[PDB]
Ligand binder design. Structure first.
Ligand code: G16
Ligand code: G16
Ligand code: G16
Ligand code: G16
Ligand code: BGC
Ligand code: BGC
Ligand code: BGC
Ligand code: BGC
Ligand code: NA
Ligand code: NA
Ligand code: NA
Ligand code: NA
Lengths: 899, 899
């Protein structure tokens, strides 16, 4: 018996105590939290990688899929077909391909050219080349994943070292190998670890399976973790499978007290020195070689084969795990040990076969014990998550060592149970291996990918190319020309209305003026005091007055009676009732003007629709309302568009400002044009500010080119169908409606809100400028997005919040680009009118959407620079409102008249 | 009585019950949580802005300071003196500069010019323009601050509306205006809110002060918050003052059930419509106007003055909060009301005076109650943070309304104390104002700014400009020439040694080869099998052997005996000892060679110093050690540098790979040069690979220009003082030591580790390549950095961690750039030598620092591309090791002698 007592004490270090296993286990439980923490993850050795698999198969999966399996003992390719609907039962064929150590160790090219060729052949046999089966990919290596169909190789392990793969996306690398053949096509929908595939396979048969275990060439385990614990994944909803990658357990010296001189030497001779340390003590790629080392040691010390040592006993890999197994058998063990040991050149005795068969026991028993330590850690984790006092679950398993060894399973289980008493665990052995689980993943992954493709196809219609935008620019310019030239003005959609403001402030403006601001989100009355000279100052006061929607769409008389009533109140408010003051009337609607003080409303726009107003001079309408009330008397000097009023406001201090831009409720622009071009106003001397009214761009159909199903719905249900089409693709009154219609469509398709269109989503105007702006704020937590939505009335999930956010971004991005294409046309025209190679010009801007949106102005600016590279445009924010400019305009109006 | 009854039911909406107050208080409670949360902040109206003030005065403050105060009712500039020393401990003089509405409502340029002018006048009179008086700046508006000397205006409030300021750093704007004047200098070191200044001023006299409160023109409050609750500021250590900006409470509609029609009208006539709604129900700017609006509503409805109404009564601002106070006098109350109302043109009856007074009562009382609810929320907050049942604290207060109203203070206090039962609260009125507290902040800020200045000065010596880098390149080029021309060679520091490898692999290499890899972090022996012809493959194995340090520095006899001891062990490992296999020897130290198999160690580098090696032929040394053991025999065909081996490994695949680079323990480079230039070896036909041994670059003082005090310490304490200087600014064995010496320096200065040089910090090697790479990892958590450092033995606060990271980054960046200037010199030589206008070449790279560092390679590549534009360099990473390239050299060698 000293035959055994001897070795046992010699290999003292490789016989782990139950107390020791407990320590290891506790230490792995910690390593898990480190891998799951967003703070310690970057440093942790156990990477706890997220897999993006939400749960084991339920039986709804159906279709036809191809699965690849590389990184294991065999490079296999299967075909899984399932459709319970038709009563097809899970069915699958497979085939194994030869892969020499040469390829596994060559360039990434060779390897993936080999895989692409093997897939080509596998599909040629079943002749499925035609046909578009979704491909799954079991890749048994630690991988960086942001989505299920992406796999950045973190590091080769086991038998692989292929140059130019680590830190690359194996999905992309594989694809490249395929396309290079042009032999066929392949839609790689997913990549999973073999642990994950194994968990899914057993999960399919055992609804309790919450763990995936692999103990073959290498070792590693995955399990079902709570989202509320996966710091590195946005969400708290449900659970996700986490590939622990515990092979690298101790790669940082965590297990230096457990490792032995034998582990350190196998390490020094390994393909990946210093890495996968915990694994190098466990998996069947190392076990046999670890034994051969322990023997050589003894033999050199004469404890075996007398003192004998042969070139074979020293040759790396002469002692397989196959032998560790064959020698472990109950009846044929010693007989096998004899044969194997004999072929080693040595003259083994029956005493030797007994000693050697025992070394295999100490090395074989340790591995099983270590795994029981770590797997016990996982189980503890689970029981914790559940809250249940006891634990009951299934553990999928696989791997040559676990399958073939005649003592491993039996031992490992026993130890695990002992370590974890309150755990009622069943071990289910994957038979199809990873493949069925892989297919069950691919199915879910393909299904989700189909939605994405459809969502992307729809959203793609909102994407405009550099060239499309140049066309838009070009069409805008053409329309401008049409509006200016009198022989074509009557049919031009872009009216190019003269404002009769011939110059920006010259600093001689002086006096006290009243002003109106009507047409924006706020109607207001102002008092503006302007003083010129050495000491120039501007003093203003505002009061916002509400206009009830009823009235806003009542009669002309009502509307202006209300306006005049509000003026009356304001005059009282400023304590200035009595004297007849000059008034600048900012009226944000297309007006045909014959002089500064006359403007005939061409048509209502935005939300305004008062009766008996269109066709009337709004200055006349105001004067009438003033006379009717007969309290005070005013001297209406001018009617001005908000674009023009805004440009003048900014021009006050910025003499390079010759363009006005509004992006708020509506959208429109104005600029200084040469009189020789304003064919609609007699005279070709000096300049005139032109109110473009560019919102009507596209009203003749010149944009049907880029308008979508959703734009037409918005236009068709508006107060002014067929009109202001360009504006309806840009301004804050409409962007929300575009988004809303997209969401209604997506919900019906079943992509959003469980496919149930809430009463809220049917409410028009729900997505106000304010909401759109909040939704798109950068680095905003999905949690916050979901909060905003639910606070509107939309009960959405994280996935929904993402989609909604993507939709808002696409609509607002397009609005910014379209706006930029228009502005691009404008500045380029100015540049040419001036005969310049390069033009510096500033635009005075205002509008709630422009001010609030976190991306609009940025993207709009980038677009203008991109489309008119010969112009350097500066955008200047108006912070005083149009009233200031209107007052400045009224001043010049009073002087000129006074002549 | 009958009167008070009527009014009471008419303004019932403004009579706030305690239940309501408690409700409002709970509301503010939640708003605080939202403002502090990283998730909800972007949508919270209560911004909870960090102030970067860690605590109230600790008594160590002293110096002469200037303080600005803008945003209150008076623009004020002060001078504060604090010394110990003298006493008068705190002495201060101030002046109030007139600031008309025009300045407050005009351009930002004009506003800050005005401020800069006043600051000038103030400094002129005190003739202190020449002193270095630090300036603190009290700016009472909500600001975004990442550091105490930065203040980005979020929004104007109260009476201010100056264009071009919101979204800008007011510190920059002010400096800008100051530099425009060219009148003087101003070191603005800190910006604080008036709440903060108040808290610090009161905190100076009362060490229990934890809150600063303002109830004047506007209303706000700050308080000491735990850092663990401040999501937007990384850190959990200590506390920081939080500026709540509670004026904007309700701006999202959260208080619409509290706001009345009168509040809504006040808003519509306000300078900031829709903003600071809570503030508009509270502060002195609004209370009076709020009263006037109510008198108007009543007069119209007949409830006051027989229904009489006058122009003065209807005018904005005619009823000041000053009248509200006077009319609430105890006192002349009804009397004062008589006169105020009599000036308003109305015909006030004694009952009118009573009615009016009771109105003022409701309005002002609501204000005090609202403030008590929000302050209560803060008090409750402070208590929970302590975790105690009772709370004792002092609230610093200031503001005209609170100082002058005859009832407010009393009512506010009573209600507050009622809302927060278990708390003893002292209200300490700040009589001196914000100046004293501002100066206190300025003292600490300045002290800190001084440390930053010194740190930035030191680190600045590691910054290299584009132009400096071009010089390094130029100098490198000259050194290369010296090394190549035989007339300057002997004295040249960059040796440009010949390797006697004349061509990259031609693809015909074939056979089995032994290889040795000595000089890197790992000593190893490799077996390389190169099959060429139709099919070309490369199968290689290897084992790592340790070399015990003594031996590394013992005798050439022992070193090479060990080397051979290992070579033998490996032959057994591969199970092939008998044949005289050809061997490639990678020895990475400068070697003077006459043939491919002759290598005379010129000098040791890195950590090697075995005796009786230098001056010998390392091949002769190896051949001896082999002959002594007598066990077996081999045929050493060549001795190669790791740069040459690496180049050949990478050029096996890439035919444009004509350059080698190593950035690991040491740093060096080789390249294919033209024999016409290799003056040291006979002939001018074909090419020759030159091992530059560029590490010695600078050993003749040519870099003394950029070497720092820390470079000199590292060099002077090394095993090879005065040699490998360039390498000592680049490679992994040294960078850590540069950082360590900087840290020791900063620690003595007292910038780091509480000025305690630990035993750990005194240990050399502490900052190994591995650690340097972890600590600089992108988007890594500060917590993670502190963890790594703490695990080294260094007790580091979060600030410490910031500095150490910054230091590591400065050092690695310079290393990458210096390396880049070297490569730029090399490639550009190839180009010029081959009379090309553009050159495309790839460089084979290896080395742990290069592989592990998160930025080195990226920055290096960038520098190469910037300094040698006419060159397009590709960096192919070697994953096979130098052994492969060595075997490729052996091959060609073995062929040459028979052939
Ligand atoms: O073992 P197989 O070929 O059925 O393959 C099965 O087990 C392997 C692990 O064990 P080994 O490394 O011994 O292959 C897994 O990697 C593979 O995904 C699975 O299909
Ligand atoms: O928005 P406000 O009231 O400051 O008003 C400002 O911008 C409006 C457009 O933007 P929106 O339609 O978003 O109001 C203009 O019509 C208005 O003249 C201008 O003073
Ligand atoms: O009031 P001051 O000039 O002593 O100034 C004091 O109180 C002001 C607030 O109260 P108000 O808005 O009523 O001025 C603060 O802004 C100022 O920092 C403080 O020194
Ligand atoms: O680093 P290894 O062991 O792969 O070794 C590799 O890199 C070393 C440089 O880098 P370091 O000094 O960091 O080792 C080289 O000297 C060695 O020839 C090469 O095979
Ligand atoms: O194949 C079993 C295991 O081998 C390990 O080396 C890999 O890192 C794992 O991804 C895999 O699960
Ligand atoms: O308010 C911005 C713009 O809205 C457009 O719909 C109106 O037709 C324009 O007159 C106005 O400039
Ligand atoms: O001055 C008292 C308060 O007024 C508010 O309107 C400002 O936003 C605060 O920054 C300031 O503390
Ligand atoms: O091993 C990397 C480099 O280290 C330098 O210090 C040595 O002098 C070189 O021979 C070598 O190329
Ligand atoms: Na999560
Ligand atoms: Na004309
Ligand atoms: Na913090
Ligand atoms: Na020569």
């Amino acid at each position: 018996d000293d035959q055994v007592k001897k070795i046992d004490k010699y290999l003292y270090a490789m016989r782990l105590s139950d107390e020791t296993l407990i320590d290891i286990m506790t230490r792995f439980r910690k390593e898990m939290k480190n891998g799951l923490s967003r703070d310690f993850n970057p440093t942790a050795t156990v990477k706890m990688l997220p897999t993006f698999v939400r749960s084991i198969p339920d039986g709804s999966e159906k279709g036809d899929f191809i699965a690849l399996d590389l990184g294991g003992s065999s490079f296999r390719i299967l075909r899984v077909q399932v459709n319970h609907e038709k009563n097809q039962n899970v069915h699958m064929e497979s085939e194994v391909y030869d892969t020499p150590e040469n390829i596994v160790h060559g360039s990434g090219s060779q390897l993936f050219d080999h895989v692409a060729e093997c897939l080509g052949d596998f599909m040629e046999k079943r002749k499925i080349k035609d046909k578009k089966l979704p491909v799954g990919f079991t890749f048994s290596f630690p991988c960086q994943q942001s989505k299920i169909d992406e796999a950045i190789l973190i590091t080769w392990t086991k038998r692989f070292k292929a140059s130019g793969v680590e830190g690359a996306d194996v999905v992309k690398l594989l694809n490249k190998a395929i396309k290079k053949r042009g032999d066929y096509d392949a839609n790689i929908v997913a990549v999973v670890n073999d642990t994950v595939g194994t968990m899914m396979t057993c999960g399919y048969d055992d609804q309790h399976c919450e763990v995936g275990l692999i103990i073959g060439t290498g070792t590693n385990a995955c399990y079902m973790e709570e989202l509320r614990h996966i710091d590195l994944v946005e969400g708290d909803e449900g659970r996700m499978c986490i590939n622990t990658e515990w092979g690298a357990f101790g790669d940082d010296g965590s297990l230096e007290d457990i490792r032995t001189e034998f582990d350190r030497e196998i390490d020094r001779g390994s393909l990946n020195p210093g890495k996968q340390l915990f694994e190098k003590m466990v998996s069947g790629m190392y076990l046999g070689e670890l034994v051969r080392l322990i023997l050589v040691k003894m033999a050199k010390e004469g404890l075996l084969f007398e003192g004998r040592i042969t070139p074979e006993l020293l040759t790396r890999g002469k002692f397989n795990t196959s032998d560790v197994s064959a020698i472990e058998k109950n009846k044929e063990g010693l007989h096998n040990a004899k044969e194997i040991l004999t072929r080693l050149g040595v003259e083994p005795s029956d005493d030797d076969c007994v000693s050697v068969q025992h070394v295999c026991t100490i090395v074989s028993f340790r591995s099983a014990n270590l795994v029981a330590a770590t797997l016990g850690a996982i189980l503890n984790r689970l029981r914790d998550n559940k809250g249940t006092p006891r634990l009951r679950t299934t553990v999928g398993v696989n791997g040559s060592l676990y399958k073939t060894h005649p003592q491993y399973s039996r031992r490992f289980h026993k130890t695990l149970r002992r370590l974890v008493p309150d755990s009622d665990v069943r071990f289910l052995l994957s038979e199809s291996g990873s493949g069925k689980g892989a297919a069950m993943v691919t199915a879910v992954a393909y299904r989700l990918a189909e939605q994405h493709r459809q969502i992307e196809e729809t959203l793609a219609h909102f994407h405009l190319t550099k060239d499309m935008l140049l066309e838009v620019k070009k069409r805008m310019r053409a329309e401008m020309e049409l509006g200016l030239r009198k022989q074509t003005h009557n049919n031009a959609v872009v009216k190019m209305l003269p404002s009769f403001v011939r110059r920006t402030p010259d600093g001689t403006e002086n006096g006290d003026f009243l002003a109106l601001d009507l047409g924006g989100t706020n109607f207001r009355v102002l008092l503006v005091k302007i003083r010129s000279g050495k000491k120039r100052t501007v003093e203003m006061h505002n009061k916002i007055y509400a206009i009830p929607i009823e009235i806003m769409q009542g009669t002309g008389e009502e509307l202006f009676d209300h306006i005049v009533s509000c003026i009356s109140d304001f005059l009282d408010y400023m304590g200035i009732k009595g004297p007849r003051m000059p008034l600048g009337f900012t009226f944000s609607f297309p007006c045909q003007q014959t002089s500064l003080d006359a403007g005939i409303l061409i048509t209502w726009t935005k939300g305004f629709k008062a009766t008996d107003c269109v066709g009337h001079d709004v200055v006349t309408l105001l004067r009438d309302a003033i006379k009717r009330r007969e309290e005070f008397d005013l001297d209406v000097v001018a009617v001005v568009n908000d674009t023009v009023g805004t440009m003048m406001t900014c021009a006050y201090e910025e003499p390079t400002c010759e363009v006005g831009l509004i992006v708020g409720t509506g959208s429109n622009a104005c600029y200084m044009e040469e009189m020789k071009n304003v064919e609609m106003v007699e005279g070709d001397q000096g300049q005139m500010c032109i109110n473009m009214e560019w919102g009507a761009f596209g009203d003749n159909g010149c944009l049907d080119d880029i308008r979508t199903h959703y734009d037409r719905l918005v236009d068709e249900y508006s107060l002014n169908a067929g009109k202001q089409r360009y504006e309806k693709m840009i301004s804050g009154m409409y962007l929300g409606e575009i988004v809303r219609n997209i969401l209604i469509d997506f919900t019906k398709k079943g992509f959003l809100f469980r496919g149930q269109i809430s009463e809220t989503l049917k409410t028009r105007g729900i997505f106000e400028t304010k909401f759109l702006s909040q939704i798109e704020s950068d680095r905003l937590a999905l949690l916050q997005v979901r909060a905003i939505l639910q606070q509107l009335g939309l009960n959405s999930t994280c996935d929904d919040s993402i989609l909604v956010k993507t939709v808002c971004g696409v609509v607002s991005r397009r609005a910014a680009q379209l706006c930029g294409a228009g502005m691009a046309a404008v500045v380029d025209k100015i540049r040419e009118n001036r005969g310049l190679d390069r033009l510096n010009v500033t635009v005075g801007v205002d509008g709630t959407l422009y001010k609030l949106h976190p991306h609009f102005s940025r993207i709009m600016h980038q677009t203008v620079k991109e489309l008119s590279p010969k112009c350097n445009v500066s955008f200047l924010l108006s912070e005083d409102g149009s009233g200031k400019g209107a007052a400045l305009i009224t001043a010049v109006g009073v002087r000129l008249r006074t002549e």
